[PDB]
Curated annotation (Swiss-Prot), chain G:
Enzyme Commission number, as recorded: 7.1.1.2
GO cellular component, one term: mitochondrial inner membrane
Residues spanning the membrane: 3-23, 25-45, 59-79, 89-109, 149-169, 178-198, 200-220, 237-257, 274-294, 325-345
UniProt record similarity statement: Belongs to the complex I subunit 2 family.
Protein's name according to its UniProt entry: NADH-ubiquinone oxidoreductase chain 2
Species in which this protein is naturally found: Sus scrofa
Length: 140, 122, 55, 459, 104, 56, 347, 53, 69
């Protein structure tokens, strides 16, 4: 829910990297749980233990991606002394993409994920800076 | 969000309030009406072609009825559209007149007093 | 190397590959009401908490 | 300017009411008359534009483009009637209808006073072109070529639509005169950077910019001859026209957002010129030539100087004429031997001398021999780039040498040597083909005689 | 049948010179082809090309090149005689410009 | 005998008629933008003893 | 089935929809939905076969669940405010359940699985009815409560509908399933602009209904339900294939065709709010619908597929039944963009 | 969407049952008749947005 | 050529003036309409964005078999 989002976003950028990584790991784990729930519903795994294995695999993948993204993003922000710079989010996104590539054992997936997650995270940082709204409230 | 659904004095299924009679009707040579007649003529041609009839010559009464019907509907459509736009402008002007604080007319400045930054192209 | 392979690889071939994979993922359902009614239950529960608990 | 629009709309029922054996004659005669009428648009002013109404206006940048469109229609008609002889009457009329609709959309695009109307027409030009390519092409690659042509264009053009409606909600107008008079600088923020990209990428993909040009060889090779003519001569210039129009509101952000596109244009100019040196298909060579020349035009528009704008206008007109002529020259040999491979039919100067003369003149204008308007545009752009930075001359210099090399390579491979022994079906050149080449080439030199008519509004 | 489909054979191409040794390449019908040649030549070379080039050559000077030249001659004459500078760096009179009060 | 000639070559008047109609419509469009006729600071002029409007 | 009984059932379907549209009481709206469903179930089984029976069963189960949730949301709203009038819906949980129930009725993603299946399992006339008339009541109810709607849920479901419609349509060779995925994407477009302007929702609904009617009537005219059976129509009626090609182009959203108008107006309306990212994604995604419309146009009109010998016998006979409104539907589907400012009469 | 046929023809198809303060049989009152009456009277004719505040 | 095919510069000059006036007024009107729509939807005190409320004429003002309603 938005409680996790607020827990992540309340901490300043280049401070307390361990807490930010923990919040990112929680967000990733929640996303992975939802993904595994939908996957099990639409694609039954033929065995309870197999369903547990698939849930654990998806959840661990997502949690690891989130943890890596948060850790490297915060570390870069505090090392460069440059908060509010999208390049930190780009680095975190590429690190998460390379984590996904290592997790699926595929070089092409790793490279594509690095590029796309880095670009998406940088875009999210730009949106936070400039006030871009994904779901604008009706104004007129 | 519905802007005009509940405007006071609106009659539910009227399509043409009596207030609309105070506006000049569209001219019968209005280019929009001519385009509606063109749409009716195209419908007649397509009707001829689908039924495997000579496209241009098959039914002149049918083509005339098509053009006439499209023009007839378009006239009232244009009247209603113009009425709605007149209503919108009337409401806009009344609201601006009744809320002077939200629409201030500030002092005019000539270009000889406004400092604009110059960006060279080189 | 560039015009026939990599410029092709990055923009149009990647787009085609991704769209085809997602089309295969989305469109390949067995048509069993059990599975996607379970999906409906998951959606309903998520919806109350994710968007409904926050008003 | 309804005195030009209405006669084309009348070309439509004139074609659909003609006898089965007079469609080409009627279409050609009335297309030529419409071109003569459009010739009156060249009487332009020195300070403002001709403001015909609230909807249409004519500048010194769009008048030569309109004249080029109206002049290109009859040439396409003459070039098409050879290979469409076995077609039924209804399908021939539909082909002519597609060409007429394309001309009408192009004529309205170059004179629209608002940016949204310009967008709607510049996007409506897609349907006739796609239909022509995918219906009257020869090989099975035409379907893929149509898909590439469609989606490359739309993926660039839709963000432009979003940006345009946003700009109208912000400033209250999209009318070009109001936009010009009430111009305000763009700050340096991520929102403004993405607005710049949305306003620029559609025109970039139309040119097309190097790395975004893969659709062009497919579409220009797989199309019929009239499709290739109008794709190379007019439809590529939509990007340049739109970019010179839209750059009015992009300052001072362009001062640094132009760097990646400038580097892409110069290096990809070198690359496409080099690609022309090893090409087995004669039409793909002409397509890559178009890419190189358009890269030069992109550079000129991006550096934003009066000399660069003059050079861009002149180069666009000259390239349209030259590339259309080259495509027709290649189509003659294709119709003779039914193959596009360049080294199949050789020594053609022995068999067709006058066609060899036409080949020589076309390839001389391709390499920008002075004092052709090709060279006038190229030299203006080179001078503007040199003022921008003295190191561009090296890249520009390399391009000039390479262009000459591949142009004369094409000429020597096709015309000189010894004729292939097994090919015995090379009939003499028809009067129609010679008239087509003459009507391509004579206006080029006539325009050289009076070059201020193609130098744009910055003159 | 060891075939896949019923199809017409690919036909040989027709030579317009066979039935018309002077064929002009416009149509198979000699009369229509001759008149197509005639209308193309007359309306392309005789009408649009030559007459249009003459019209463009004799277009009136709406670009105001000669007017500008004469105006500049008048201005140079007046400024040279009076001892005034030929040209001024500022194109706008500073009396109508109001700079900001403070620069500190 | 002109019946067949007319029925074979009546498609030759569509384009000139469209041209003259476009000229007429352009004149009509110009007729609706005279709000500043003889009113600009650069071209404001006293009327001649006979003429009514400075341009049409 | 007796023609009199069929006409009575059709009028009962329309009576339920009109009762939904004219009522002021939540109970009467629920009754209208019940009556509409009760009359609609037999129309889906008019041509009896196992596939039609399966389609009817799936439709009944989905719609009965949706109406149960609808009634529960009404009762919760009554509990927290003793109001039966259809208004701003004073309770948020009730509004969430109401939104989910109406989305289930419309077939918006995540609850979009039933639409391809029911459309493929019934006849083309039943599909025409299901994909045109059955959208009116839930959309009208959504329009009447648009102020209390939560944008985050509605916009999420709309974007999911556009994405899933495009992706699912990419994979189909059956024409009814293609139509169903197209319907899903257009429903997404309709519901994306609902919290901002209901006039745009109505305009998009009308244009979509016109294009869908034209497409279904063209498909009924040339009795094709698969891509390969539609590939034969050129050798029997080429005019039908040409008109279908132009209508398919219009459905794609290419200017200057009428299909482009709703997307254009919705993008403008969303940029009148802040809302920049969402229209950009929506257009980029509608490119997928354009892709599979273009593939259908390639297969049926722009190339000629091989035919069979027995088509010669069909050449000798004409179409007996004639659809009187098909030419007007085609013209309205294609050549209506210049009349865009007439949408002001919709509000 | 909503076609106010009842308002146009003056029919009262279902408005009689919408609120608790509207003409019950034998004049039996709702438990919260006065509160609903006051809320309705206070919010009548000012529109939904103004009324909520 | 000038006498036969073209007019003087003043015609184009003043037509441009008229066009510019019309377009500027339209732009100002568009901006003003957007602002008015924003204010009306925010405050709900204008003719636009009026949402239905229960009719007061539905209330029965009769003795209710109990003195306290
Ligand atoms: C940034 C913050 C968070 C962002 C959230 C949004 C992003 C979502 C990302 C998730 C992507 C899901 C789809 C891609 C995966 C592909 C499917 C798959 O199983 O392959 C797995 C693949 C390997 O498995 P595989 O077995 O090899 O797959 C081969 C088969 O072909 C694959 O199996 P298959 O082909 O046989 O099919 C399996 C099945 C599986 O079906 C699915 O997976 C369903 C997809 C839904 C996932 C979306 C949930 C996210 C919601 C987040 C909400 C907030 C959370 C807090 O697919 C289908 O059936 C498709 C049918 C389509 C029906 C759609 C119904 C879904 C409902 C709509 C979406 C959700 C609605 C929510 C509420 C709606 C109310 C209006 O790789 C993985 O394991 C990855 C799994 C999860 C990774 C997610 C990454 C998360 C990163 C977070 C970092 C945090 C950063 C810090 C924040 C600050
Ligand atoms: C006001 C609005 C709200 C309304 C809603 C609220 C309602 C609340 C009231 C609830 C009161 C209960 C009333 C009874 C309901 C009727 C149930 C029923 O009839 O069962 C039919 C259904 C099918 O009947 P059947 O055909 O006779 O039996 C077929 C065999 O059972 C299976 O045959 P098979 O061996 O061939 O299949 C393999 C096996 C394999 O099964 C599996 O693979 C499941 C293993 C998943 C691992 C669990 C995750 C572990 C960690 C997650 C912990 C989350 C928090 C912690 C965070 C991380 C910690 C580090 O089963 C399946 O694949 C079928 C799918 C069943 C999965 C459960 C579906 C629920 C949603 C999907 C969850 C997916 C899990 C992913 C993670 C999601 C969060 C937990 O039976 C079942 O599916 C299992 C029995 C369920 C009964 C108890 C569960 C009720 C849950 C109610 C709500 C909670
Ligand atoms: C418009 C004009 C034109 C533009 C468009 C055209 C040009 C751009 C597109 C074309 C090139 C882009 C392609 C990217 C790589 C594609 C990978 C791929 O296709 O995977 C599927 C494909 C399928 O593989 P699979 O099915 O998963 O398994 C079978 C494997 O093949 C079996 O694998 P294996 O057993 O043979 O060994 C694989 C192993 C070992 O590979 C080998 O066996 C041989 C050793 C090769 C490794 C090279 C690393 C050491 C040399 C680097 C020296 C310096 C770099 C140059 C810069 C100099 C600066 C002055 O590689 C690794 O373990 C990877 C670990 C990471 C080390 C390499 C990555 C370095 C990142 C570059 C940093 C650049 C930052 C910016 C710098 C700015 C200053 C200029 O993967 C491969 O087979 C290729 C493996 C190697 C890929 C990494 C090479 C990196 C190339 C440079 C990337 C820069 C471009 C992207 C920049 C944007 C990103 C944010
Ligand atoms: C923007 C500015 C204004 C433009 C407006 C928009 C465009 C024009 C209006 C569009 C609608 C009007 C026509 C609708 C009915 C056409 C249906 C048809 O089949 O026509 C055949 C029909 C020939 O049939 P027939 O004469 O009975 O005997 C021959 C057999 O039927 C032999 O027939 P068959 O069936 O055996 O032949 C088979 C053939 C049959 O297939 C077709 O004929 C295709 C026709 C489809 C109709 C178009 C769809 C609906 C309209 C949407 C247009 C969208 C335009 C926007 C841009 C997008 C481009 C698509 O199929 C094929 O060969 C397959 C070829 C594949 C090519 C795919 C391209 C098709 C789409 C192209 C549409 C372009 C616009 C219309 C083109 C003109 C059509 C006549 O054509 C005509 O003769 C009628 C056309 C001329 C009527 C207007 C003349 C007015 C009177 C003259 C005086 C003018 C007054 C001036 C006032 C001043 C005083 C002097
Ligand atoms: C194949 C051909 C395709 C067509 C080519 C299109 C060209 C697009 C390139 C865009 C040009 C510039 C875009 C943004 C302008 C500056 C870029 C940035 O790197 O510069 C620095 C930006 O700093 C860092 O680089 C932050 C950006 C890092 C994240 C961006 C991701 C780049 C990774 C490469 C992905 C490939 C993109 C293209 C996809 C195909 C400047 O520092 P800063 O002053 O702080 O930012 C200026 C903006 N301010 C003033 C509002 C603050
Ligand atoms: C086959 C055998 C060939 C060889 C034999 C040939 C024999 C000799 C004939 C060759 C002529 C030699 C050329 C020498 C130049 C003399 C002509 C020149 O003096 O005229 C120019 C005039 O040339 C014209 O201005 C240029 C022609 C315009 C070209 C437009 C082309 C027509 C439209 C066709 C379609 C358009 C397609 C392209 C779209 C943009 C001068 O311009 P200008 O300095 O002012 O005149 C000053 C006096 N004025 C102003 C009062 C008139
Ligand atoms: C987030 C969502 C973004 C959606 C972006 C979609 C871009 C629109 C293009 C969609 C292309 C879909 C093609 C596809 O998926 O199928 C692969 C297809 C399979 O062929 P079929 O015709 O389906 O099968 C016939 C024989 N069985 O493979 C192909 O060969 C495709 C050929 C044409 C592809 C052309 C695509 C060119 C794209 C240019 C770049 C722009 C892409 C769009 C995004 C731009 C980036 C912002
Ligand atoms: C086939 C190749 C063609 C590819 C072309 C695609 C690239 C197009 C460029 C990006 C288009 C999206 C821009 C959106 C339109 C701009 C309008 C605008 O100005 O909006 C900005 C907001 O700008 C944005 O939101 C844009 C964010 C981007 C969202 C979508 C990302 C698309 C992909 C990004 C990277 C790709 C772009 C470059 C690609 C180069 C070509 C390959 C102002 O909004 P406000 O909120 O009011 O500002 C102040 C108040 N906060």
């Amino acid at each position: 829910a938005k409680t996790l989002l607020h827990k992540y976003s309340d901490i300043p950028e280049g401070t307390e990297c361990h807490r930010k990584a923990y919040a990112s790991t929680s967000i990733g784990g929640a996303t992975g749980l939802i993904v595994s729930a939908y996957s099990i519903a639409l694609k039954p795994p033929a065995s309870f233990l197999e369903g547990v294995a698939r849930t654990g695999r998806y959840t661990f993948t997502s949690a690891a991606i989130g943890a890596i993204f948060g850790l490297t993003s915060c570390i870069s922000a505090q090392v460069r002394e440059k908060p509010d710079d999208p390049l930190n989010y780009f680095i975190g996104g590429c690190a998460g993409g390379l984590t996904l590539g290592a997790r699926t054992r595929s070089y092409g997936i790793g490279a594509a994920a690095c590029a796309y997650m880095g670009l998406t995270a940088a875009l999210v940082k730009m949106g936070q800076l400039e006030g871009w709204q994904v779901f604008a409230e009706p104004k007129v | 969000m519905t802007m005009m659904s509940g405007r006071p004095g609106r009659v539910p299924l009227q399509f043409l309030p009596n207030e609309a009679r105070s506006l000049p009707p569209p001219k019968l040579t209005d280019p929009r009406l001519v385009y509606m007649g063109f749409l009716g003529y195209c419908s007649g041609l397509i009707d001829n072609a689908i039924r495997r009839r000579p496209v241009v010559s098959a039914g002149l009464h049918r083509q005339l009825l098509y053009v006439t019907s499209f023009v007839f509907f378009g006239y009232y459509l244009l009247k209603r559209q113009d009425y709605m736009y007149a209503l919108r402008d009337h409401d806009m002007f009344a609201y601006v007149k009744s809320h002077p604080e939200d629409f201030p007319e500030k002092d005019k400045k000539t270009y000889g007093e406004i400092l604009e930054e110059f960006h060279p192209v080189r | 190397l560039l015009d026939l392979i990599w410029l092709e690889t990055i923009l149009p071939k990647t787009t085609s590959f991704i769209q085809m994979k997602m089309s295969i993922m989305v469109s390949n359902q067995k048509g069993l009401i059990k599975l996607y009614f379970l999906s409906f239950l998951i959606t309903i529960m998520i919806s109350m908490t994710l968007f409904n608990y926050h008003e | 300017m309804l005195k030009i629009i209405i006669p084309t709309t009348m070309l439509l029922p004139m074609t659909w009411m003609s006898k089965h054996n007079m469609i080409w004659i009627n279409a050609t005669v009335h297309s030529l008359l419409i071109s003569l009428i459009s010739l009156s648009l060249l009487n332009q002013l020195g300070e403002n534009s001709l403001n015909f109404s609230l909807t249409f206006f004519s500048d010194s940048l769009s008048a030569p483009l309109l004249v080029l469109t109206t002049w290109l229609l009859p040439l396409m008609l003459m070039a098409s009637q050879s290979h469409l002889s076995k077609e039924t009457t209804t399908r021939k009329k539909l082909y002519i209808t597609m060409l007429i609709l394309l001309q009408l959309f192009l004529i309205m695009t170059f004179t629209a006073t608002e940016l949204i109307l310009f967008y709607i027409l510049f996007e409506a030009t897609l349907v006739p072109t796609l239909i022509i390519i995918t219906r009257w092409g020869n090989q099975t690659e035409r379907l893929n070529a149509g898909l590439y042509f469609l989606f490359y264009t739309l993926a660039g053009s839709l963000p432009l639509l979003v940006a345009l409606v946003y700009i109208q909600n912000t400033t209250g107008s999209l009318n070009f005169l109001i936009i010009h008079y009430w111009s305000h600088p763009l700050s340096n923020s991520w929102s403004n950077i993405f607005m710049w990209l949305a306003c620029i990428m559609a025109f970039m993909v139309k040119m097309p910019l190097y790395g975004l040009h893969l659709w062009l060889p497919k579409a220009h090779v797989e199309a019929p001859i009239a499709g290739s003519m109008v794709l190379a001569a007019v439809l590529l210039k939509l990007g340049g026209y739109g970019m010179m129009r839209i750059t009015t509101i992009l300052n001072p952000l362009t001062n640094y957002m132009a760097y990646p596109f400038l580097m892409l244009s110069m290096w990809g100019m070198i690359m496409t010129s080099s690609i022309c040196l090893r090409q087995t298909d004669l039409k793909s060579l002409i397509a890559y030539s178009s890419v190189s020349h358009m890269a030069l035009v992109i550079v000129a528009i991006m550096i934003q100087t009066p000399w660069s704008f003059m050079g861009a206008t002149a180069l666009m007109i000259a390239h349209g004429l030259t590339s259309s002529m080259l495509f027709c020259l290649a189509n003659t040999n294709y119709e003779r031997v039914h193959s596009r491979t360049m080294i199949l039919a050789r020594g053609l100067q022995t068999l067709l001398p006058l066609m060899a003369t036409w080949w020589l003149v076309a390839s001389l204008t391709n390499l920008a021999l002075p004092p052709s308007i090709n060279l006038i545009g190229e030299l203006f752009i080179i001078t503007a780039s040199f003022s921008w930075s003295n190191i561009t001359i090296i890249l520009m210099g390399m391009n000039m040498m390479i262009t000459a090399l591949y142009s004369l390579y094409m000429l020597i491979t096709t015309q000189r040597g010894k004729y292939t022994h097994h090919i015995n079906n090379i009939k003499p050149s028809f009067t129609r083909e010679n008239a087509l080449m003459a009507l391509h080439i004579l206006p080029l030199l006539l325009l050289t005689l009076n070059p201020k008519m193609i130098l744009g509004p910055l003159y | 049948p060891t075939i896949r489909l019923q199809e017409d054979p690919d036909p040989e191409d027709e030579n317009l010179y066979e039935k018309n040794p002077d064929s002009h390449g416009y149509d198979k019908d000699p009369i229509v082809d001759l008149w197509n040649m005639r209308v193309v030549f007359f309306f392309g070379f005789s009408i649009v090309l030559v007459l249009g080039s003459t019209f463009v050559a004799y277009l009136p000077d709406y670009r105001m090149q000669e007017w500008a030249r004469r105006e500049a001659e008048r201005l140079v004459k007046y400024r040279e005689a009076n001892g005034l500078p030929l040209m001024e760096s500022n194109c706008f009179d500073p009396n109508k410009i109001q700079l900001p009060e403070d620069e500190d | 005998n002109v019946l067949q000639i007319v029925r074979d070559h009546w498609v030759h008047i569509l384009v000139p008629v469209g041209f003259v109609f476009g000229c007429y419509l352009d004149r009509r469009s110009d007729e609706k933008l005279t709000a500043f006729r003889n009113k600009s600071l650069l071209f404001k002029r006293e009327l001649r003893p006979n003429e009514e409007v400075t341009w049409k | 089935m007796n023609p009199i009984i069929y006409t009575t059932l059709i009028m009962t379907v329309m009576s339920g929809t009109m009762l939904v549209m004219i009522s002021s009481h939540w109970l009467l709206i629920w009754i209208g939905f019940e009556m509409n469903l009760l009359a609609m179930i037999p129309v889906l089984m008019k041509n009896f076969n196992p596939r039609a029976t399966e389609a009817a069963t799936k439709y009944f189960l989905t719609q009965a669940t949706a109406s149960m949730m609808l009634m529960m949301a009404i009762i919760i709203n009554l509990l927290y405010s003793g109001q039966w009038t259809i208004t701003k819906m004073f309770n948020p949980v009730a509004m969430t359940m109401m939104t989910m129930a109406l989305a289930m009725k419309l077939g918006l993603s995540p609850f979009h699985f039933w639409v391809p299946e029911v459309t493929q399992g019934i006849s083309l006339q039943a599909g025409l009815l299901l994909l045109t008339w059955q959208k009116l009541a839930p959309l009208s109810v959504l329009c009447q409560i648009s102020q209390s709607i939560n944008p985050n849920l509605m916009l999420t479901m709309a974007m999911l509908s556009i994405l899933i419609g495009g992706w699912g349509g990419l994979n189909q060779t059956q024409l009814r399933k293609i139509m169903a995925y197209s319907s899903i994407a257009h429903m997404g477009w309709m519901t994306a602009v609902l919290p901002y302007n209901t006039t745009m929702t109505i305009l998009n609904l009308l244009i979509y209904i016109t294009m869908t009617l034209a497409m279904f009537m063209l498909l009924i005219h040339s009795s094709a339900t698969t891509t390969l059976s539609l590939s034969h129509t050129w050798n029997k009626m080429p005019v039908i294939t040409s008109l279908m090609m132009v209508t398919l182009l219009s459905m794609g959203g290419l200017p200057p065709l009428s299909g482009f108008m709703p997307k254009w107006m919705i993008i403008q309306e969303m940029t009148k709010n802040e809302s920049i990212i969402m229209p950009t994604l929506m257009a980029m995604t509608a490119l997928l619908n354009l892709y599979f419309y273009m593939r259908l146009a390639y297969s049926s009109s722009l190339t000629m597929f091989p035919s069979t010998n027995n088509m010669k016998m069909k050449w000798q006979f004409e179409h007996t039944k004639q659809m009187k409104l098909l030419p007007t539907m085609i013209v309205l589907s294609t050549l209506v963009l210049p009349m865009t400012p007439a949408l002001s009469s919709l509000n | 969407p909503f076609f106010d046929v009842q308002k146009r023809l003056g029919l009262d198809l279902d408005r009689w049952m919408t609120i608790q303060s509207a003409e019950q049989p034998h004049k039996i009152p709702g438990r919260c008749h006065a509160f609903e009456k006051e809320w309705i009277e206070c919010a009548h004719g000012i529109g939904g947005i103004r009324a909520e505040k | 050529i000038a006498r036969t095919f073209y007019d003087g510069p003043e015609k184009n000059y003043e037509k441009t003036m008229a066009i510019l006036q019309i377009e500027a007024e339209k732009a100002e009107l568009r901006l003003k309409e957007l602002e008015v729509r924003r204010l009306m939807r925010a405050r709900g005190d204008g003719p636009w964005y009026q949402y239905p409320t229960i009719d007061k004429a539905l209330i029965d003002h009769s003795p209710k078999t109990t003195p306290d309603n």
